[PDB]
């Protein structure tokens, strides 16, 4: 029930518009694990990664709900490092990591978070 500003807030639309990148495809995670990815982000924009939960009715226009916003915490030139712990605050379910870089969007496909 929290609002978000990114362009794609529905998984179907995200999957049919954003670019899939393997660096964001972490696989299934369990509470206690850590999300930690390094991605090339170029020479003119700095990326931001969000973890959204996929939930809702099939009729809902919005089925992506933001759980975390992650900033680049690395020191590597033209790359971004995005790290966040998978705590119990992430209710078991299906999630997706999305990166906004300038006006473009990237994602790692859906994955599960389990107890």
XYZ file of N, CA, C and O in Angstrom:
460
model
N 0.826 -1.261 0.000
C 0.000 0.000 0.000
C 0.836 1.276 0.000
O 0.317 2.378 0.239
N 2.117 1.108 -0.302
C 3.049 2.219 -0.370
C 3.272 2.560 -1.841
O 3.427 1.685 -2.696
N 3.260 3.849 -2.133
C 3.378 4.345 -3.488
C 4.803 4.267 -4.006
O 5.726 4.209 -3.210
N 4.971 4.257 -5.341
C 6.297 4.175 -5.934
C 6.297 5.020 -7.222
O 5.258 5.130 -7.874
N 7.448 5.581 -7.593
C 7.560 6.452 -8.764
C 8.100 5.866 -10.069
O 8.047 6.507 -11.134
N 8.605 4.645 -10.010
C 9.207 4.022 -11.195
C 8.165 3.711 -12.264
O 6.988 3.520 -11.986
N 8.619 3.622 -13.500
C 7.701 3.435 -14.609
C 6.851 2.157 -14.627
O 5.647 2.237 -14.872
N 7.455 1.007 -14.359
C 6.738 -0.272 -14.398
C 6.403 -0.785 -13.006
O 7.293 -1.180 -12.244
N 5.114 -0.857 -12.690
C 4.684 -1.322 -11.369
C 3.846 -2.583 -11.473
O 3.122 -2.937 -10.554
N 3.903 -3.212 -12.636
C 3.217 -4.453 -12.895
C 4.260 -5.403 -13.492
O 4.987 -5.000 -14.402
N 4.299 -6.655 -13.010
C 5.310 -7.611 -13.470
C 5.206 -7.875 -14.974
O 6.223 -7.940 -15.655
N 4.002 -8.058 -15.510
C 3.863 -8.288 -16.939
C 4.530 -7.142 -17.724
O 5.299 -7.373 -18.664
N 4.255 -5.891 -17.337
C 4.824 -4.759 -18.056
C 6.323 -4.674 -17.886
O 7.047 -4.397 -18.862
N 6.798 -4.954 -16.693
C 8.252 -4.948 -16.424
C 8.935 -5.979 -17.320
O 9.904 -5.683 -18.034
N 8.388 -7.182 -17.331
C 8.954 -8.273 -18.097
C 8.874 -8.041 -19.586
O 9.652 -8.643 -20.334
N 7.961 -7.206 -20.042
C 7.822 -6.929 -21.468
C 8.456 -5.601 -21.903
O 8.370 -5.227 -23.070
N 9.098 -4.902 -20.977
C 9.751 -3.610 -21.296
C 11.162 -3.430 -20.781
O 12.020 -2.907 -21.494
N 11.429 -3.834 -19.558
C 12.767 -3.658 -19.008
C 13.727 -4.661 -19.579
O 13.320 -5.723 -20.047
N 15.005 -4.347 -19.537
C 16.013 -5.267 -20.030
C 16.458 -6.228 -18.961
O 16.815 -5.841 -17.863
N 16.431 -7.511 -19.267
C 16.906 -8.513 -18.347
C 18.430 -8.541 -18.334
O 19.069 -8.543 -19.398
N 19.020 -8.539 -17.129
C 20.466 -8.624 -16.965
C 20.806 -9.715 -15.950
O 20.246 -9.779 -14.852
N 21.709 -10.603 -16.319
C 22.073 -11.729 -15.439
C 22.697 -11.362 -14.114
O 22.516 -12.093 -13.126
N 23.334 -10.191 -14.044
C 23.957 -9.740 -12.799
C 22.902 -9.502 -11.715
O 23.231 -9.490 -10.516
N 21.646 -9.255 -12.117
C 20.576 -9.065 -11.142
C 19.820 -10.340 -10.769
O 18.952 -10.340 -9.887
N 20.115 -11.457 -11.449
C 19.428 -12.763 -11.214
C 20.107 -13.614 -10.125
O 20.780 -14.605 -10.404
N 19.747 -13.301 -8.882
C 20.302 -13.873 -7.670
C 19.824 -15.266 -7.279
O 20.430 -15.929 -6.442
N 18.705 -15.664 -7.865
C 18.134 -16.964 -7.573
C 17.315 -16.823 -6.312
O 17.168 -15.737 -5.768
N 16.803 -17.933 -5.817
C 15.981 -17.915 -4.605
C 16.837 -17.639 -3.383
O 17.989 -18.111 -3.283
N 16.280 -16.879 -2.449
C 16.992 -16.510 -1.212
C 16.200 -16.926 0.030
O 14.977 -17.141 -0.044
N 16.903 -17.092 1.146
C 16.297 -17.453 2.424
C 16.629 -16.386 3.454
O 17.616 -15.664 3.304
N 15.782 -16.242 4.472
C 16.073 -15.293 5.543
C 17.467 -15.643 6.069
O 17.758 -16.820 6.316
N 18.324 -14.635 6.214
C 19.697 -14.831 6.687
C 20.685 -14.647 5.560
O 21.878 -14.419 5.820
N 20.215 -14.788 4.325
C 21.072 -14.582 3.148
C 21.271 -13.077 2.926
O 20.659 -12.219 3.586
N 22.138 -12.750 1.980
C 22.397 -11.364 1.652
C 22.310 -11.189 0.149
O 22.763 -12.031 -0.603
N 21.627 -10.144 -0.289
C 21.520 -9.797 -1.718
C 22.783 -8.972 -1.944
O 22.984 -7.986 -1.254
N 23.630 -9.346 -2.910
C 24.883 -8.602 -3.129
C 25.278 -8.778 -4.579
O 25.692 -9.864 -4.988
N 25.114 -7.710 -5.349
C 25.416 -7.702 -6.776
C 26.300 -6.546 -7.212
O 26.229 -5.461 -6.647
N 27.108 -6.769 -8.248
C 27.984 -5.728 -8.834
C 27.578 -5.651 -10.311
O 27.592 -6.678 -11.005
N 27.300 -4.450 -10.805
C 26.790 -4.236 -12.152
C 27.453 -3.075 -12.857
O 27.680 -2.018 -12.232
N 27.792 -3.229 -14.134
C 28.339 -2.120 -14.907
C 27.232 -1.078 -15.115
O 26.159 -1.422 -15.644
N 27.469 0.181 -14.768
C 26.452 1.229 -14.899
C 26.820 2.409 -15.796
O 26.096 3.390 -15.914
N 27.964 2.336 -16.451
C 28.332 3.358 -17.402
C 28.979 4.614 -16.872
O 29.220 4.747 -15.693
N 29.188 5.571 -17.776
C 29.867 6.808 -17.464
C 29.097 8.082 -17.389
O 29.705 9.147 -17.479
N 27.785 8.008 -17.198
C 27.015 9.245 -17.105
C 25.858 9.254 -16.086
O 25.387 10.317 -15.733
N 25.473 8.086 -15.580
C 24.410 7.927 -14.587
C 24.820 6.934 -13.523
O 25.605 6.030 -13.782
N 24.306 7.082 -12.315
C 24.538 6.183 -11.190
C 23.251 5.387 -10.982
O 22.156 5.971 -10.997
N 23.323 4.061 -10.842
C 22.101 3.285 -10.662
C 21.618 3.149 -9.246
O 22.331 3.381 -8.281
N 20.334 2.795 -9.136
C 19.647 2.525 -7.869
C 18.897 1.211 -8.105
O 18.308 1.006 -9.174
N 18.901 0.337 -7.104
C 18.187 -0.936 -7.197
C 17.074 -1.017 -6.145
O 17.257 -0.588 -5.007
N 15.902 -1.480 -6.536
C 14.818 -1.712 -5.625
C 14.421 -3.182 -5.678
O 14.507 -3.820 -6.736
N 14.035 -3.720 -4.528
C 13.490 -5.047 -4.381
C 11.972 -4.852 -4.170
O 11.566 -4.164 -3.231
N 11.170 -5.400 -5.078
C 9.728 -5.357 -4.985
C 9.159 -6.752 -4.761
O 9.687 -7.747 -5.259
N 8.052 -6.830 -4.024
C 7.339 -8.066 -3.840
C 6.239 -8.102 -4.922
O 5.613 -7.090 -5.242
N 6.014 -9.276 -5.506
C 4.978 -9.466 -6.522
C 3.764 -10.080 -5.794
O 3.830 -11.243 -5.344
N 2.662 -9.335 -5.704
C 1.485 -9.830 -5.032
C 0.295 -8.997 -5.423
O 0.412 -7.841 -5.816
N -0.872 -9.605 -5.315
C -2.097 -8.926 -5.663
C -2.944 -9.767 -6.591
O -2.561 -10.855 -7.019
N -4.109 -9.238 -6.901
C -5.031 -9.908 -7.751
C -4.611 -9.697 -9.199
O -4.023 -8.692 -9.542
N -4.921 -10.667 -10.050
C -4.630 -10.590 -11.469
C -5.277 -9.390 -12.185
O -4.872 -9.015 -13.277
N -6.284 -8.790 -11.579
C -6.942 -7.630 -12.174
C -6.317 -6.287 -11.783
O -6.619 -5.255 -12.427
N -5.443 -6.321 -10.785
C -4.813 -5.093 -10.296
C -3.796 -4.514 -11.277
O -2.950 -5.240 -11.794
N -3.866 -3.214 -11.548
C -2.891 -2.546 -12.433
C -1.501 -2.569 -11.778
O -0.497 -2.736 -12.462
N -1.457 -2.464 -10.464
C -0.211 -2.465 -9.680
C -0.070 -3.725 -8.874
O -0.917 -4.034 -8.036
N 0.946 -4.529 -9.209
C 1.210 -5.771 -8.472
C 2.655 -5.905 -7.957
O 3.049 -6.970 -7.501
N 3.418 -4.815 -8.061
C 4.810 -4.730 -7.549
C 4.777 -3.777 -6.336
O 4.238 -2.676 -6.451
N 5.284 -4.194 -5.178
C 5.248 -3.400 -3.952
C 6.660 -3.262 -3.446
O 7.324 -4.261 -3.156
N 7.145 -2.038 -3.321
C 8.519 -1.798 -2.901
C 8.821 -2.223 -1.476
O 8.124 -1.832 -0.548
N 9.831 -3.069 -1.305
C 10.300 -3.513 0.011
C 11.615 -2.860 0.400
O 11.897 -2.706 1.597
N 12.447 -2.498 -0.565
C 13.737 -1.892 -0.236
C 14.297 -1.099 -1.383
O 14.134 -1.497 -2.534
N 14.970 0.014 -1.076
C 15.666 0.861 -2.069
C 17.133 0.714 -1.653
O 17.492 0.932 -0.483
N 17.988 0.341 -2.593
C 19.400 0.099 -2.320
C 20.285 1.016 -3.173
O 20.182 1.063 -4.420
N 21.162 1.767 -2.518
C 22.109 2.643 -3.218
C 23.433 1.956 -3.440
O 23.741 0.968 -2.796
N 24.188 2.447 -4.412
C 25.501 1.921 -4.744
C 26.446 2.198 -3.571
O 26.672 3.361 -3.240
N 27.012 1.149 -2.987
C 27.937 1.249 -1.852
C 29.362 0.815 -2.203
O 30.163 0.577 -1.301
N 29.657 0.691 -3.489
C 30.984 0.288 -3.933
C 31.849 1.493 -4.253
O 31.396 2.628 -4.201
N 33.117 1.251 -4.568
C 34.044 2.316 -4.946
C 34.579 2.121 -6.356
O 35.416 2.907 -6.815
N 34.000 1.181 -7.090
C 34.469 0.822 -8.433
C 33.952 1.743 -9.518
O 32.755 1.890 -9.739
N 34.885 2.334 -10.226
C 34.575 3.282 -11.318
C 33.618 2.726 -12.356
O 33.868 1.685 -12.928
N 32.515 3.438 -12.594
C 31.507 3.102 -13.589
C 30.714 1.806 -13.315
O 30.032 1.292 -14.201
N 30.831 1.304 -12.093
C 30.081 0.133 -11.678
C 29.351 0.483 -10.384
O 29.680 1.459 -9.717
N 28.335 -0.292 -10.069
C 27.581 -0.144 -8.828
C 27.559 -1.441 -8.050
O 27.468 -2.522 -8.650
N 27.635 -1.357 -6.719
C 27.548 -2.542 -5.852
C 26.302 -2.294 -4.993
O 26.202 -1.268 -4.344
N 25.376 -3.255 -4.992
C 24.088 -3.151 -4.269
C 23.980 -4.316 -3.296
O 23.903 -5.470 -3.723
N 23.986 -3.985 -2.007
C 24.003 -4.983 -0.947
C 22.938 -4.755 0.112
O 22.787 -3.632 0.609
N 22.160 -5.782 0.440
C 21.182 -5.604 1.507
C 20.880 -6.981 2.132
O 20.808 -7.972 1.411
N 20.703 -7.052 3.479
C 20.400 -8.332 4.101
C 18.962 -8.789 3.900
O 18.037 -7.955 3.905
N 18.770 -10.095 3.712
C 17.418 -10.640 3.590
C 16.969 -11.003 5.024
O 17.314 -12.068 5.576
N 16.211 -10.090 5.617
C 15.698 -10.239 6.972
C 14.271 -10.788 6.938
O 13.708 -11.004 5.866
N 13.685 -11.011 8.113
C 12.323 -11.515 8.196
C 11.279 -10.504 7.738
O 10.125 -10.870 7.511
N 11.674 -9.245 7.599
C 10.771 -8.205 7.115
C 10.290 -8.571 5.690
O 9.255 -8.086 5.230
N 11.065 -9.402 4.974
C 10.684 -9.875 3.660
C 9.841 -11.158 3.851
O 10.390 -12.272 3.912
N 8.525 -10.985 3.871
C 7.580 -12.078 4.024
C 7.785 -13.143 2.945
O 7.988 -12.796 1.784
N 7.767 -14.443 3.311
C 7.929 -15.409 2.235
C 7.011 -15.123 1.029
O 5.831 -14.831 1.187
N 7.579 -15.150 -0.162
C 6.814 -14.894 -1.373
C 7.721 -14.710 -2.565
O 8.874 -15.152 -2.536
N 7.189 -14.071 -3.605
C 7.896 -13.835 -4.859
C 8.302 -12.379 -4.947
O 7.516 -11.479 -4.642
N 9.548 -12.140 -5.364
C 10.147 -10.799 -5.459
C 10.886 -10.585 -6.751
O 11.077 -11.540 -7.496
N 11.280 -9.337 -7.003
C 12.064 -9.019 -8.196
C 12.938 -7.830 -7.911
O 12.536 -6.924 -7.177
N 14.174 -7.852 -8.426
C 15.108 -6.747 -8.274
C 15.108 -5.961 -9.582
O 15.255 -6.533 -10.677
N 14.953 -4.643 -9.460
C 14.900 -3.739 -10.593
C 15.912 -2.623 -10.414
O 16.039 -2.088 -9.311
N 16.637 -2.276 -11.477
C 17.574 -1.183 -11.461
C 17.135 -0.077 -12.393
O 16.743 -0.346 -13.548
N 17.133 1.155 -11.889
C 16.847 2.332 -12.699
C 18.227 2.965 -12.963
O 19.008 3.198 -12.022
N 18.523 3.252 -14.231
C 19.815 3.857 -14.615
C 19.436 4.893 -15.643
O 19.134 4.575 -16.793
N 19.437 6.148 -15.237
C 18.978 7.196 -16.164
C 17.498 6.961 -16.442
O 16.728 6.697 -15.533
N 17.100 6.996 -17.711
C 15.704 6.785 -18.085
C 15.404 5.312 -18.378
O 14.269 4.976 -18.739
N 16.387 4.425 -18.208
C 16.220 3.014 -18.534
C 16.078 2.118 -17.321
O 16.558 2.425 -16.230
N 15.445 0.976 -17.534
C 15.205 0.007 -16.487
C 15.721 -1.374 -16.850
O 15.633 -1.788 -18.005
N 16.212 -2.063 -15.826
C 16.783 -3.412 -15.891
C 16.229 -4.284 -14.793
O 15.784 -3.738 -13.763
N 16.161 -5.599 -14.980
C 15.637 -6.457 -13.918
C 16.316 -7.807 -13.975
O 16.962 -8.129 -14.971
N 16.182 -8.592 -12.910
C 16.800 -9.911 -12.827
C 15.829 -11.081 -12.822
O 16.245 -12.229 -12.593
N 14.571 -10.801 -13.177
C 13.506 -11.786 -13.180
C 13.040 -12.095 -11.760
O 13.771 -11.899 -10.780
N 11.839 -12.624 -11.616
C 11.355 -12.956 -10.300
C 12.146 -14.075 -9.599
O 12.780 -14.904 -10.239
N 12.067 -14.110 -8.269
C 12.721 -15.122 -7.440
C 11.936 -15.256 -6.147
O 11.112 -14.399 -5.828
N 12.150 -16.336 -5.410
C 11.456 -16.534 -4.161
C 12.311 -16.204 -2.936
O 13.538 -16.315 -2.975
N 11.647 -15.710 -1.893
C 12.264 -15.483 -0.591
C 11.473 -16.445 0.310
O 10.248 -16.415 0.333
N 12.186 -17.299 1.033
C 11.562 -18.280 1.936
C 12.126 -18.184 3.342
O 13.160 -17.558 3.557
N 11.449 -18.817 4.298
C 11.899 -18.806 5.686
C 13.204 -19.597 5.797
O 14.007 -19.366 6.713
